[PDB]
């Protein structure tokens with residue numbers, strides 16, 4: 001199972017750094033993930049780090065984005081977003097590039113299968129990630145079944161492609177599952193609580209997928225506060 005393959009351990013979390021916090025040594029040879037604990041793009045990299053067993057290797061540097069140290073855009077990462085990864089004398093951004101990079105260049109269990117047909121489907125699903133987010137996050141003011149429905153339907157139908165297991169690529173938990181879960185997690189809570197919309201209604205495979213991803217310790221360790229998420233999304237979109 002995916003849980004058996006998981007190399008994560010329970011982890012103590014340091015408080016996020018505010019505007020006055022000292023800057024961690026830059027390019028001292030220690031690998032660092034600049035992040036924010038509630039950011040779903042960063043959560044992608046967080047889960048990947050955990051699953052591959054890279055927690056000691058990859059130090060977390062969590063920031064309060066609403067009140068972040070100026071040294072971050074000035075001295076670490078000019079695009080001024082999280083996540084970014086400090087490794088091999090550079091700072092690399094883009095959550096999808098980062099989970100791919102952990103998988104191609106770091107130790108730990110595989111998060112991409114070898115099967116060529118699965119590799120191709122993975123690329124299609126990676127490509128669809130911003131269209132998925134684009135569709136649902138712009139649907140809050142309209143008829144949800146018309147506006148957000150087709151995007152969840154796309155995930156439901158994608159899950160019918162490989163019949164050897166409940167994940168997007170079938171049998172094995174992968175980078176694809178990791179790419180989607182932080183957004184499905186938050187969307188599920190927000191839509192149900194605020195709009196009375198159950199994304200799992202009529203989407204059997206999607207429901208199985210959420211349940212199965214949720215058995216994985218690497219993921220559970222990274223989950224955000226439901227109540228805080230709702231207040232945040234009401235303020236952001238309503």
Ligand SMILES: N[C@@H](CCC(=O)N[C@@H](CS)C(=O)NCC(=O)O)C(=O)O
Nearest residue numbers: 039040041080081082083094095096
């Ligand atoms: N396309 C980027 C987006 C990352 C991103 O937008 N992170 C947000 C947090 S949800 C952020 O750093 N926003 C703070 C800002 O823009 O100042 C990725 O996938 O890595």
Ligand SMILES: [Ca+2]
Nearest residue numbers: 053054055056
């Ligand atoms: Ca390790």
Ligand SMILES: [Ca+2]
Nearest residue numbers: 160161162163
């Ligand atoms: Ca099928």
Ligand SMILES: [Ca+2]
Nearest residue numbers: 159162163165
């Ligand atoms: Ca399946």
